[PDB]
Tab-separated table of N, CA and C in Angstrom:
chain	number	residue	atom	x	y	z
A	1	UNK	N	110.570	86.870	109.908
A	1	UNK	CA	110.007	87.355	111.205
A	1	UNK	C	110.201	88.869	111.266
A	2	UNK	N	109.151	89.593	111.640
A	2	UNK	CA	109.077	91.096	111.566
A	2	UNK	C	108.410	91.476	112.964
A	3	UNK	N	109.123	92.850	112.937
A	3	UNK	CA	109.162	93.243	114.290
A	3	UNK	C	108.764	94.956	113.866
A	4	UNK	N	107.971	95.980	114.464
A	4	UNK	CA	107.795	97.202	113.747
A	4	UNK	C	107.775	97.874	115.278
A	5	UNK	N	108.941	99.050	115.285
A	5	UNK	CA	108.892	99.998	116.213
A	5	UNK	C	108.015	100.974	116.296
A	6	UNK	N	107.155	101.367	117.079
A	6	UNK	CA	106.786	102.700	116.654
A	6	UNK	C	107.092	103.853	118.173
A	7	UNK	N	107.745	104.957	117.318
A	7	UNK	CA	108.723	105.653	118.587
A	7	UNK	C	109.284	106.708	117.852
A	8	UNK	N	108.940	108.075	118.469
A	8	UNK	CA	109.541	109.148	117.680
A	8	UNK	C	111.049	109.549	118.523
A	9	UNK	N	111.484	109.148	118.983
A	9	UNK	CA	113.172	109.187	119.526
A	9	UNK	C	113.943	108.435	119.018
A	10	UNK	N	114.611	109.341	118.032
A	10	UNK	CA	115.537	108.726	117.327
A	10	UNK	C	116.893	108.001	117.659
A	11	UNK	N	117.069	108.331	118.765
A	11	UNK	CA	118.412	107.862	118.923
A	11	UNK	C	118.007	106.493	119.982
A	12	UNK	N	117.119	106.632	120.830
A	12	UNK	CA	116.389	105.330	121.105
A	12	UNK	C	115.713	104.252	120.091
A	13	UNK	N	114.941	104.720	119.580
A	13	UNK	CA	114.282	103.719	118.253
A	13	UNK	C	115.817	103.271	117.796
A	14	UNK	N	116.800	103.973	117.522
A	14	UNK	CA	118.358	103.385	116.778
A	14	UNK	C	118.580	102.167	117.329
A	15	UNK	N	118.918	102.671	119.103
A	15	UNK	CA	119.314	101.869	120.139
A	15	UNK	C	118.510	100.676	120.223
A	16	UNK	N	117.005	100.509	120.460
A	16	UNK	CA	116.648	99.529	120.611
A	16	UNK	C	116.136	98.350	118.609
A	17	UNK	N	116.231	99.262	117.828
A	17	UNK	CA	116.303	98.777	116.862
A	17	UNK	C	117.827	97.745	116.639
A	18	UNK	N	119.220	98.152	117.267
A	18	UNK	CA	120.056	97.624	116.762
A	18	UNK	C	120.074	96.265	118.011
A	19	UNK	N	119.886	96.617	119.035
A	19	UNK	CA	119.399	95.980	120.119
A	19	UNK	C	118.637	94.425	120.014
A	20	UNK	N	117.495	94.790	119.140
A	20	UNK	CA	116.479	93.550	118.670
A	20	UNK	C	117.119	93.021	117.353
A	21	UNK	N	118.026	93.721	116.375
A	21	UNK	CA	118.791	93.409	115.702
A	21	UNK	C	120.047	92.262	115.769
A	22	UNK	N	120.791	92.777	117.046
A	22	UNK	CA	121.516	92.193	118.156
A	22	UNK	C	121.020	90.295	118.033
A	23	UNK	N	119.847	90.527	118.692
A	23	UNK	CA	118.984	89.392	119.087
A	23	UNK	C	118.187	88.549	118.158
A	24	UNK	N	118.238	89.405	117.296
A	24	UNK	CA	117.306	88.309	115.963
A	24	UNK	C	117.909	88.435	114.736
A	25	UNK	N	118.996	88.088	114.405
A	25	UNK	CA	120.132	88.164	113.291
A	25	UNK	C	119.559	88.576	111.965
A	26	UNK	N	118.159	87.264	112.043
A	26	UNK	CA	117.407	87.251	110.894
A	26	UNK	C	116.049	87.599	110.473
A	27	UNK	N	115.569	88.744	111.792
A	27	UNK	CA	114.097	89.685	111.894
A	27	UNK	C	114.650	90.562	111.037
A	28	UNK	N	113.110	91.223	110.229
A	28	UNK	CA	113.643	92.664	109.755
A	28	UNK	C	112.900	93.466	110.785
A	29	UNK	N	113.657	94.164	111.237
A	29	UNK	CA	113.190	95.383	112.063
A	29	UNK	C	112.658	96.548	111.101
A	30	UNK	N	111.640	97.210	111.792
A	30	UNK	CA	111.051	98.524	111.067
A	30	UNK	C	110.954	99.678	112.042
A	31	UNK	N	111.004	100.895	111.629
A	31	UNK	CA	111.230	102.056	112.930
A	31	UNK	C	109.707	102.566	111.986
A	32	UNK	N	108.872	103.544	113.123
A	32	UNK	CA	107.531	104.527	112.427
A	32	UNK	C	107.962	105.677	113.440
A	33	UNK	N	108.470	106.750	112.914
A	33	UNK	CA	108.890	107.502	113.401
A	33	UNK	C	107.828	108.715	113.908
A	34	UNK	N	106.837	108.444	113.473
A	34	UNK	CA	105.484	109.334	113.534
A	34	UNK	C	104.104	108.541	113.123
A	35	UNK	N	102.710	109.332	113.863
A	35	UNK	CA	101.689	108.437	113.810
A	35	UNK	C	101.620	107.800	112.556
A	36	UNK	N	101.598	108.613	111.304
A	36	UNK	CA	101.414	108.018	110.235
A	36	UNK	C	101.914	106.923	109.401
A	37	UNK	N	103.152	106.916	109.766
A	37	UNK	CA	103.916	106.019	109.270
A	37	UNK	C	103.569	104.772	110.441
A	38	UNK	N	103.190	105.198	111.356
A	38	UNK	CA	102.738	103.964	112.674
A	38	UNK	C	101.548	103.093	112.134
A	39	UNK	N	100.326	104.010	111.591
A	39	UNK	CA	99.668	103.391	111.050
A	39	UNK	C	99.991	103.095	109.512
A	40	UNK	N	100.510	103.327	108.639
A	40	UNK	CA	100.822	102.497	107.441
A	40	UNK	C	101.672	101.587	107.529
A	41	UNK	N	102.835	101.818	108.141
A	41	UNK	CA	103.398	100.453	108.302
A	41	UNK	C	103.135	99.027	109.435
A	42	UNK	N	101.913	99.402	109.832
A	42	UNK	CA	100.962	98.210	110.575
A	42	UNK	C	101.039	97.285	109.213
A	43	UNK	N	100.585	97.946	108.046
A	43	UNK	CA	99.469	96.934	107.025
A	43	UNK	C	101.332	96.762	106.545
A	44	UNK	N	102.131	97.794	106.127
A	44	UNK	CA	103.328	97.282	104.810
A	44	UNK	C	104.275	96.675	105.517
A	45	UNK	N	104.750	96.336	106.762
A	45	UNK	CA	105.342	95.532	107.362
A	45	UNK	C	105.212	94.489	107.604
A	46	UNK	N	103.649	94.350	108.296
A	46	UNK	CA	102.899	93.124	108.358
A	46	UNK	C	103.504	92.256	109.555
A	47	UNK	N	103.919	92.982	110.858
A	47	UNK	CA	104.470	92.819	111.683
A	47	UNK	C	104.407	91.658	112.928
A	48	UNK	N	105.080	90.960	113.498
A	48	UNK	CA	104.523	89.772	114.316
A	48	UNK	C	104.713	90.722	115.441
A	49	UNK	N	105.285	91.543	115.666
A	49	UNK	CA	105.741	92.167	117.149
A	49	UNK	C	105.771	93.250	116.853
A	50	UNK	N	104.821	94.081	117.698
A	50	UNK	CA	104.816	95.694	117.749
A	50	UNK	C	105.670	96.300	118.974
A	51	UNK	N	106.501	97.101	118.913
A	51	UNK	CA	106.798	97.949	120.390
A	51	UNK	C	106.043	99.235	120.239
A	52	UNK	N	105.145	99.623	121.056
A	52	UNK	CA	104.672	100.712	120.964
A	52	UNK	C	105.044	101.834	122.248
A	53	UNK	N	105.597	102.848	121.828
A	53	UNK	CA	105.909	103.988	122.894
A	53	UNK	C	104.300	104.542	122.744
A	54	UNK	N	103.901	104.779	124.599
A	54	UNK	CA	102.665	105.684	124.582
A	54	UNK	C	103.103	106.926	124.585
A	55	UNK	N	103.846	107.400	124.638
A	55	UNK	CA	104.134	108.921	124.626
A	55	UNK	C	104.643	109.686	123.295
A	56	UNK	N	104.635	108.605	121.965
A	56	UNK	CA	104.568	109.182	120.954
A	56	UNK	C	103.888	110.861	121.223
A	57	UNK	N	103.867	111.410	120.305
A	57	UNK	CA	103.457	113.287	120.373
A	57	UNK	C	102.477	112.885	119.094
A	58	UNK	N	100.802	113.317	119.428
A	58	UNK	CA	100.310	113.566	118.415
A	58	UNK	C	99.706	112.110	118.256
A	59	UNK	N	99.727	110.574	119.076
A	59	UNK	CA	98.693	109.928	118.954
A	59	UNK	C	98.590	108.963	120.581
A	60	UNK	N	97.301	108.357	120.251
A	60	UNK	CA	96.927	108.002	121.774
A	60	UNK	C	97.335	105.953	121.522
A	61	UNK	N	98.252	106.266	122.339
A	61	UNK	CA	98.986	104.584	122.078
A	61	UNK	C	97.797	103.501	122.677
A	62	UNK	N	96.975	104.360	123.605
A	62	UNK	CA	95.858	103.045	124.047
A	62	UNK	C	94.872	102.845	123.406
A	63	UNK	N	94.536	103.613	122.012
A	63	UNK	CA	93.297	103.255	121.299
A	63	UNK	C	94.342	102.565	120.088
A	64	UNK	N	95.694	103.216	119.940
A	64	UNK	CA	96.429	102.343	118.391
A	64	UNK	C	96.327	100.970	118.944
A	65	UNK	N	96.571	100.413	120.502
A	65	UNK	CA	97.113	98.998	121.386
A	65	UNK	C	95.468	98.011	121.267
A	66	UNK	N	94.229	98.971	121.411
A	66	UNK	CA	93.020	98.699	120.868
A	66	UNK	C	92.641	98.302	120.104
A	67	UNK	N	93.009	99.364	118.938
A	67	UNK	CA	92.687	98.758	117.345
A	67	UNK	C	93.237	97.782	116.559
A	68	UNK	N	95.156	97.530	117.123
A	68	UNK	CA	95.782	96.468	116.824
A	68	UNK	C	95.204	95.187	116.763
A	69	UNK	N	94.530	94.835	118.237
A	69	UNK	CA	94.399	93.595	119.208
A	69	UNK	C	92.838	93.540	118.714
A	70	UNK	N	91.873	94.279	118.362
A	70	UNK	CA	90.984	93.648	118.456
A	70	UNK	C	90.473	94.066	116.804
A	71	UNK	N	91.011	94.199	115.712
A	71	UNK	CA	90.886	93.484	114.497
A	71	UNK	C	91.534	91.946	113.896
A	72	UNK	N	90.677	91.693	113.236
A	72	UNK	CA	90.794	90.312	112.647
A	72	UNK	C	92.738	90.067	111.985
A	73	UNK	N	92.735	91.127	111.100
A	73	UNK	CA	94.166	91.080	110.648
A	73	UNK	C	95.236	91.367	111.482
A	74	UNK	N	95.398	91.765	112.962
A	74	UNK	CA	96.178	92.181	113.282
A	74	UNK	C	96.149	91.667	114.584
A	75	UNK	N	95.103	90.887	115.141
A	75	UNK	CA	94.483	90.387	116.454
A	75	UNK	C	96.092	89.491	117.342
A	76	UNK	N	96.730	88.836	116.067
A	76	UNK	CA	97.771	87.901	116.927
A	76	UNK	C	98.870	88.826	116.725
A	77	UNK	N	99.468	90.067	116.204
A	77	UNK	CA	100.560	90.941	116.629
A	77	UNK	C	100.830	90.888	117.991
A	78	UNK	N	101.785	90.657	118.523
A	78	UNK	CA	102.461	90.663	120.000
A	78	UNK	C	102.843	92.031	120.025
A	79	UNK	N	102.020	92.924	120.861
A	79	UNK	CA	102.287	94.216	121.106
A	79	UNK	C	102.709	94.164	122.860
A	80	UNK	N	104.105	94.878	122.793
A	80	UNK	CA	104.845	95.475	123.764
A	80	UNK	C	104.945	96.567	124.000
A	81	UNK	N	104.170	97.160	125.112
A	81	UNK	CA	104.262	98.669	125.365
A	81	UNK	C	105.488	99.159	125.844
A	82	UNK	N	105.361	100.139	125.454
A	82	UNK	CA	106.657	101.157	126.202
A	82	UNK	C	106.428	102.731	126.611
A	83	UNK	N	106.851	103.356	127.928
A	83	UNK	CA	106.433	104.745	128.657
A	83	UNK	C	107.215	105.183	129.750
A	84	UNK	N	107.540	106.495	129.399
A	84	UNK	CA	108.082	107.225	130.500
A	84	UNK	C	107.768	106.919	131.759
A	85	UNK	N	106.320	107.934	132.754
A	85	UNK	CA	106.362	107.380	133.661
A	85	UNK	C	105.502	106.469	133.798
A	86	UNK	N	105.928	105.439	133.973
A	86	UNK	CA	105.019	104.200	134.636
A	86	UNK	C	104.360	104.306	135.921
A	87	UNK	N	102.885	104.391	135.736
A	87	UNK	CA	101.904	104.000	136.756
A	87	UNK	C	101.317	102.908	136.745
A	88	UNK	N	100.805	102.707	137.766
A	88	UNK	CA	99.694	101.267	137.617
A	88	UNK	C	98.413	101.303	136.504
A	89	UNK	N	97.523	102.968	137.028
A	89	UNK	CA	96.402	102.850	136.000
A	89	UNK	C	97.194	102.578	134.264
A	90	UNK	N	98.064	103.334	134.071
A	90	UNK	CA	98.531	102.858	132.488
A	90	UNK	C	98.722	101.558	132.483
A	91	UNK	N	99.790	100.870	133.099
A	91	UNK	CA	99.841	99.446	132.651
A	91	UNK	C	98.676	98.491	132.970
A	92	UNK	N	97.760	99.018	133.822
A	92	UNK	CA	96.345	98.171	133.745
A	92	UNK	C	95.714	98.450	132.291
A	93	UNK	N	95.667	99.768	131.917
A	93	UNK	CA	94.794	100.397	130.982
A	93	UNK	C	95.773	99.407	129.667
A	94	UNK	N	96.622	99.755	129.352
A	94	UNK	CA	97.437	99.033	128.171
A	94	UNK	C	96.765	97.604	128.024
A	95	UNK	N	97.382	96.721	129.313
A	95	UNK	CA	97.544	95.290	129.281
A	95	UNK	C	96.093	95.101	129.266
A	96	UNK	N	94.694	95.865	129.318
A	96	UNK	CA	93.349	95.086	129.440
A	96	UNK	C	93.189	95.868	128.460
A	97	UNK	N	93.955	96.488	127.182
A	97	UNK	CA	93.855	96.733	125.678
A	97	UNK	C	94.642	95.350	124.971
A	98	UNK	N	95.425	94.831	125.135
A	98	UNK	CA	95.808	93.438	124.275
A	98	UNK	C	97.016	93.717	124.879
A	99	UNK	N	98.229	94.668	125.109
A	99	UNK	CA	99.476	94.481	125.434
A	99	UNK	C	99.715	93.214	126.400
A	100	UNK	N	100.548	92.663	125.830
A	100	UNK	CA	101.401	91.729	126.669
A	100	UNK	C	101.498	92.538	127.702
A	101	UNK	N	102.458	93.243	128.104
A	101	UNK	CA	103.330	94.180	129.264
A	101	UNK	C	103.897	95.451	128.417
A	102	UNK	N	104.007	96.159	129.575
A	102	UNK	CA	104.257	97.888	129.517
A	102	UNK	C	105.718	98.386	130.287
A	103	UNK	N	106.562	97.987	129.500
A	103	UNK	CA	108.339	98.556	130.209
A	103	UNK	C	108.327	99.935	130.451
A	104	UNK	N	108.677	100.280	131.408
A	104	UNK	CA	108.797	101.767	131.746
A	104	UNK	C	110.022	102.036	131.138
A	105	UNK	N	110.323	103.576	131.484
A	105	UNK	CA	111.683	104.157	131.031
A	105	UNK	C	112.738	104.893	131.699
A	106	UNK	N	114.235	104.060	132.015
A	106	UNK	CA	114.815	103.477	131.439
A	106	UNK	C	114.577	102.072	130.952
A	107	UNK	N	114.720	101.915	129.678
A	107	UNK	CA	113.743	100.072	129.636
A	107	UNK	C	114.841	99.578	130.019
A	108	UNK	N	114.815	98.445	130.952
A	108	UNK	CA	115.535	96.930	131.763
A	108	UNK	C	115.557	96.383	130.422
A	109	UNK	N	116.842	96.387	129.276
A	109	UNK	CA	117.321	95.595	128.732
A	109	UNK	C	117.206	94.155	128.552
A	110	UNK	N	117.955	93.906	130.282
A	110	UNK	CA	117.564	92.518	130.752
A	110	UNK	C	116.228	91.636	130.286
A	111	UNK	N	115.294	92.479	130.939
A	111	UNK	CA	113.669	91.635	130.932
A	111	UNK	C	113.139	91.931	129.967
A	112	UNK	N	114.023	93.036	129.041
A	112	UNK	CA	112.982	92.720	127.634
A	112	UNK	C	113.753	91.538	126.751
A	113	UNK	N	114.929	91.422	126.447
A	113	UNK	CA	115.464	89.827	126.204
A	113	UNK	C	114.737	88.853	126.742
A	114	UNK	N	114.238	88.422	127.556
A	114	UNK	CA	113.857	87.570	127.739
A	114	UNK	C	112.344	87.284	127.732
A	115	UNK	N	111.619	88.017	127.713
A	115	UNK	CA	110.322	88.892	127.518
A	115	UNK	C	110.049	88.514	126.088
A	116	UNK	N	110.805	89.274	125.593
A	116	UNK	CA	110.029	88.871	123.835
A	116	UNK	C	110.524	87.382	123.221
A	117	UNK	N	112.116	87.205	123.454
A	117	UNK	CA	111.934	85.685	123.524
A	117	UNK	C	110.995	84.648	123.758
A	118	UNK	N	110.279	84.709	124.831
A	118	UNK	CA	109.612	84.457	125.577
A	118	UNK	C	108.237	83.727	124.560
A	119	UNK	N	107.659	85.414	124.323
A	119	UNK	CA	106.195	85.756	123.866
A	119	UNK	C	106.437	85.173	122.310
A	120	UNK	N	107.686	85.430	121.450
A	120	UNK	CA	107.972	85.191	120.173
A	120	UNK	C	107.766	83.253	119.843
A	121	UNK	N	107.893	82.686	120.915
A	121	UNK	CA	108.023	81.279	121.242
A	121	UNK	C	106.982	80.463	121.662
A	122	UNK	N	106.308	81.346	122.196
A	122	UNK	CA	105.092	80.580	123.028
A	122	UNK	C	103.608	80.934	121.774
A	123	UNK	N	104.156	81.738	121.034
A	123	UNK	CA	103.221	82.147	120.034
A	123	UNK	C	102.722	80.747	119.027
A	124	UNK	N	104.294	80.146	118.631
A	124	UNK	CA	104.673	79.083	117.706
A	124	UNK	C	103.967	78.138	118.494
């Protein structure tokens, strides 16, 4: 089971990498620390669960949340957004791109445990 971060904050991507680590003993987690590596490690990870930060620097998280969800190879990835400030138009705009849901920031720990649990389960 694979899980691929994409998030240029390193000490967050750490945090929530060891976090989902924490929680899935036996996922390999992947960090994309920049667009490029966001888009190559889509295909070399081969990921069941995306977290995507929209505020990456340098790409637009609602056309990557687009292109994920509505190709053939990548259509059932469970993509979880993630963003500073949370408005309504973004989490409308995300979630009517394929995102499940859009955690603002500070992310609620809490509801993402149970959240991807959740989505990881109901998939099966």
């Amino acid at each position: 089971f694979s899980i691929l971060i994409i998030e240029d904050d390193k000490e967050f991507a750490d945090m929530l990498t060891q976090f989902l680590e924490n929680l899935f003993p036996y996922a390999k987690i992947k960090i994309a620390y920049n667009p490029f590596d966001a888009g190559d490690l889509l295909h070399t990870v081969k990921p069941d669960v995306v977290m995507l930060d929209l505020m990456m620097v340098g790409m637009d998280g609602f056309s990557i949340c687009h292109r994920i969800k509505s190709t053939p190879a990548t259509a059932n990835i469970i993509v979880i957004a993630m963003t500073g400030a949370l408005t309504d138009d973004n989490v409308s705009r995300i979630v009517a791109l394929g995102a499940e849901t859009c955690f603002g920031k500070p992310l609620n720990f809490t509801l993402l445990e149970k959240t991807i649990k959740q989505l990881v389960e109901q998939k099966k």
